[PDB]
Structure formats: C-alpha cells, structure tokens
Chains A and B, each alone.
Chain A
Amino acid sequence: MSRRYDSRTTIFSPEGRLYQVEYAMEAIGHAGTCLGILANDGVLLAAERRNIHKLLDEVFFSEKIYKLNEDMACSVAGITSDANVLTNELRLIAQRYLLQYQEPIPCEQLVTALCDIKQAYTQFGGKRPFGVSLLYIGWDKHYGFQLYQSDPSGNYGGWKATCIGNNSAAAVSMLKQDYKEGEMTLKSALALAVKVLNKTMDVSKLSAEKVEIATLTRENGKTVIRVLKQKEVEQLIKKHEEEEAKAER
C-alpha cells in the first residue's frame, strides 16, 4: 500500500489484509504480561494488574482475572475497559453452555463462542477491533486441565503453557523453557509463575499491588475457582524473592 482504505470497518483495507490486528498484537505488549502454567491438580493464572498505585480500595481482588463460571476463569492482557463488556458476555455464554450440556464446560467450546463476536466486529458493524488477548483456564474430564489463547482477531489455540504480554516473542519461549510436563504440582507452578513474570517485566521486586494471582484447583472432583487476596499473593512472591535477590548485586 501507499495509503490505507481503512478508517472505518464499514470500509476495508487497500489490500484486503487488516492492518489493525497487527497494531492490536503490539497493544498486548504495551500492557503487562499474562501467563498460564499447567499443574497436575490445578491450573493457575498470573497477571499484572493496571493499578500499581499504592492507594487501592481493594474491594475487588478481580480486576484483570475474572472468574466467569463454576468451572472456568479467564484473564486479560490489554485494555481493561474492553474486559468489562467481555467479562459479563463470558458469564452469559458460560452458564448458557451448562444449561443445555450440564457438563464441566471444555475450554475449546467457550473460546469458540467468543471468537464469533470478535470476528464480526472486525468485519462489519462499524465497531473498532479488540486489543486484548485473553487466557482461558478451565478443566474438563476428557483431556484434563487446559489453557487456551485467544487473539483480538478470533484466532485460537490450545496450549498447556503460554504467555502473552511484555514482548510476546520472548515471553512464550521462556515460559515453555522453564515449564516441565508431568513433574508438576500446584505450589511449584505458582512459585515458578512469579519468577517468570519477574523476568519478562522490568521490575526485579514485584508486589501484590503490582500483581494479581488466581488458582483454579479441582477439589473432590469439582472445580473451585478463586482469585486470591493480597496476603496470600505476597506469600508466593516471598518464596520467589529469595532466589531473585541472589541474582541481584
């Protein structure tokens, strides 16, 4: 090209290839890292909240990691403003699935329902593209614990370790590298989660004001999802902290 034929999504690209999506991917990198690691009794999500400021009202512990359903939770990397419509939408879909199927909703099914809305916005209706990558964490009895990655465009993939945010390229390779398979436990995936989160992020300290950590753990055959509170979060950070400290001068 030499000029876009976009300026609306009710008019389209001078190549028919959508530039806006590549700027959206860059948008996840602007925002803080989101990572998901797999465990053999749970799955956990670790995300960097928008708020770093000391003054926090703290009525919410969920401000980027939202528990949607009685089987699944998701996280946001990107603009916070976008999650609010999405999170309420996800709640509707998630319970919608239960009504008909009444099964521990699989991660692949929830993500495909959402991808229908994101692909339409980019095609028509004059709505601006999304700028969030969401990580869905859940349990089904047919493959186990799963992690899925959704992109602004509607592009999806099942992972068991994936990271986006604070330069995606580096982060996904690193998360993989430190990940091990079938050697894991929930406490050690959590200790590791802070460590990797620390390296991708500029900070070498990190606090529960900066970070918000969620578990999804299966107990007595049913999935209990909680986003953890600050004192509990701090304990995972301090566990990591001794190691981080030795790296430093």
Chain B
Amino acid sequence: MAERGYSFSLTTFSPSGKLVQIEYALAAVAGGAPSVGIKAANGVVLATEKKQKSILYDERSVHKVEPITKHIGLVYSGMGPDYRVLVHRARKLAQQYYLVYQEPIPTAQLVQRVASVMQEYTQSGGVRPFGVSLLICGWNEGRPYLFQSDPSGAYFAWKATAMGKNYVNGKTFLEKRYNEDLELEDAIHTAILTLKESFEGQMTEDNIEVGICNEAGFRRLTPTEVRDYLAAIA
C-alpha cells in the first residue's frame, strides 16, 4: 500500500528491520528539558533545568531529581506521564529488592530489570514505548554508577552522557572535558556548563536543580545549595 502502516506499528515489524518507533521516542526527549549525568568516580551528579523563574514550582515535595530509594535518584527528559508510572513501578521494584536483600538496589542490576519492563511496551501492539530516557545514578558497593536507559528498553553503560535539548553537543563536551576519576565538586561545575550549552534563555536566580550521589547517599539539593555551585561556573 505504502510505508505508513507497516513502519509505525508495534503490532507487527518495521520493514526496515529496526523499529522506527524507538527513534521517534528519542525526538520526544529532545523536546524535553536538558539533563546531564556524569559519574565522577567520587560520586554521581544529575542536574536538570527546573522551571521556577519566580519560584512557580513547589520544591518542598516535588522535584526533578527524585529519589527511587536511599541511594538511587533519577533525572529525566521527554514525556511527563510516561515517566510517572515508570517512577512508581521502579520504586516498587526497588522496595521489593530492599525487602529481600536488605540493601537498596544498585544502578547496574536495576537498569536491566527496568529495561525488561520498558521492552514489553516496545513489544506490545497498541501500546506505545515509554518516552522518557532516564539517567540513573547510584552509589552501591563502594563504587558510583551512571547508566543510560533509552526508550527502546535497553540499557547502556556510560561514564558521562547527555540527554534532552541538543544531546549531540552534550556528548561531545563530556568526552572532551571529562577524565576518568575526578572530584565530585569539580564534576558539578562541568555539569552546570553542560546544561548551559542548550539551556534556553539562561538561568535566573536559580533555575536548575542538582542532586548528588556519594558515599553518604543520594540527596536532591535545596535551591540555596544548588545556587552556590552556579556562581563558580555558570
């Protein structure tokens, strides 16, 4: 007939051999807020543009760097609904894990399990994939972790990567500046610069949120704490 029906579906296969759908999902995340994640190897940082501009956001119980469990946080890009279910399932799975082992889940096992779930929507027909790309941070076993899970339902290992607005340019800066093993404090400074490439309209008094993951654990940080790093390097 034409390509239109065949290619779009996930009730049957794309005639290309790879699905045109997951590619569509990445474009969604491009239209999202810019997000950077970098494993220093002294800790992990997740930073994102959070729209205040006058403080129009509750930062007392709702955030953009959000804890799954004690020492795991996620920062996200793309479709907002898809993510909310993804968070709630992810925490549920984590809690099942904390219950059984008595250790909060590490990023590397979690992405793989999380990927199994996102794959199901990429398999099921009438059901679209989750349109969030997640940056998972963690510190478990004495080692910091950063993983990227894409909308397809796959997990990839990265030391530093970029999502959201102009991801191509983020990944190029990260490779260039980043060195294996660094200090967590220097690492935030380059993360705020990574955002600054394709921020849009630039930072006000505070229009970012950063959360750190370290030895003591993953914590999202308060608007004041966040502001101190931004003066050093915008």
Chain A residues within CB distance 8 Å of chain B: 3-4, 6-10, 19-20, 23-24, 26-27, 30, 50-51, 53-60, 63, 79-82, 84-85, 88, 121, 126-129, 131
Known: A53-B158, A57-B146. A81 touches B153 (CB 8 A): yes
List 4 extra interface pairs beyond A63-B155, A126-B11, CB under 8 A: A20-B12, A59-B145, A79-B18, A131-B18
- When distances are taken between beta carbons in the complex, the residues of chain A under 8 Å from B174 are 55
Interface residues as binary, B17-34 with A (CB distance below 8 Å gives 1, 0 otherwise)? 111001000000000000
The answer to whether A84 touches B116, judged by C-beta atoms less than 8 angstroms apart, is: yes
- When distances are taken between beta carbons in the complex, the residues of chain A under 8 Å from B22 are 81
Q: How far is the CB of A86 from chain B (nearest CB, A)?
A: 9
The answer to whether A51 touches B123, judged by C-beta atoms less than 8 angstroms apart, is: no
Contact of A8 among B11, B17, B119 (CB under 8 A): B11
Q: Which 4 A-B pairs have the closest CB atoms?
A: A27-B17, A57-B157, A59-B108, A81-B152
Main secondary structure of the interface of B (DSSP, over half): mixed
**30 A–B contacts from the bound complex (CB under 8 Å):** A6-B6, A6-B12, A7-B9, A9-B11, A9-B125, A10-B11, A10-B125, A19-B15, A20-B15, A23-B14, A26-B17, A30-B18, A50-B154, A55-B159, A55-B178, A56-B159, A57-B108, A57-B157, A57-B159, A59-B108, A60-B157, A63-B157, A82-B119, A82-B123, A85-B116, A85-B153, A121-B123, A126-B125, A127-B125, A128-B19
The answer to whether B119 touches A85, judged by C-beta atoms less than 8 angstroms apart, is: yes
Main secondary structure of the interface of A (DSSP, over half): loop
- When distances are taken between beta carbons in the complex, the residues of chain B under 8 Å from A4 are 1, 6
The answer to whether A126 touches B126, judged by C-beta atoms less than 8 angstroms apart, is: yes
The answer to whether B119 touches A58, judged by C-beta atoms less than 8 angstroms apart, is: no
Residue of A nearest to B16 (CB): A23
Task: Compute how far the CA of A57 lies from the CA of B109 in the bound complex, rounded to whole angstroms.
Answer: 13
Residue of A nearest to B126 (CB): A126
- When distances are taken between beta carbons in the complex, the residues of chain B under 8 Å from A50 are 154, 156
Does B5 make an interface contact (CB < 8 A)?
Answer: yes
The answer to whether B119 touches A128, judged by C-beta atoms less than 8 angstroms apart, is: no
The answer to whether B123 touches A56, judged by C-beta atoms less than 8 angstroms apart, is: no
Known: A8-B11, A57-B39, A82-B119. A131 touches B125 (CB 8 A): no
Number of A-B contacts (CB under 8 A): 125
The answer to whether B120 touches A8, judged by C-beta atoms less than 8 angstroms apart, is: no
Task: Compute how far the CA of A60 lies from the CA of B6 in the bound complex, rounded to whole angstroms.
Answer: 36
Known: A7-B6, A24-B17, A57-B108. A127 touches B123 (CB 8 A): yes
Task: Compute how far the CA of A88 lies from the CA of B19 in the bound complex, rounded to whole angstroms.
Answer: 22
- When distances are taken between beta carbons in the complex, the residues of chain A under 8 Å from B146 are 57
- When distances are taken between beta carbons in the complex, the residues of chain B under 8 Å from A10 are 11, 125
- When distances are taken between beta carbons in the complex, the residues of chain B under 8 Å from A27 are 17-18
- When distances are taken between beta carbons in the complex, the residues of chain A under 8 Å from B155 are 63, 80, 84
The answer to whether B5 touches A7, judged by C-beta atoms less than 8 angstroms apart, is: yes
Interface size on B, residues (CB 8 A): 49
- When distances are taken between beta carbons in the complex, the residues of chain A under 8 Å from B9 are 7-8, 128
Does B42 make an interface contact (CB < 8 A)?
Answer: no
Residue of A nearest to B151 (CB): A81
- When distances are taken between beta carbons in the complex, the residues of chain B under 8 Å from A88 are 113, 116
Interface residues as binary, B107-147 with A (CB distance below 8 Å gives 1, 0 otherwise)? 11000110110111011111000000000000000010111
Does B57 make an interface contact (CB < 8 A)?
Answer: no
Does B98 make an interface contact (CB < 8 A)?
Answer: no
Task: Compute how far the CA of A60 lies from the CA of B123 in the bound complex, rounded to whole angstroms.
Answer: 25
Task: Compute how far the CA of A55 lies from the CA of B38 in the bound complex, rounded to whole angstroms.
Answer: 11
Residue of B nearest to A56 (CB): B157
- When distances are taken between beta carbons in the complex, the residues of chain A under 8 Å from B158 are 53, 55-57
Task: Compute how far the CA of A238 lies from the CA of B39 in the bound complex, rounded to whole angstroms.
Answer: 30
Task: Compute how far the CA of A6 lies from the CA of B5 in the bound complex, rounded to whole angstroms.
Answer: 9
Task: Compute how far the CA of A8 lies from the CA of B10 in the bound complex, rounded to whole angstroms.
Answer: 8
Residue of B nearest to A59 (CB): B108
Contact of A128 among B39, B125, B154 (CB under 8 A): B125
Task: Compute how far the CA of A122 lies from the CA of B5 in the bound complex, rounded to whole angstroms.
Answer: 17
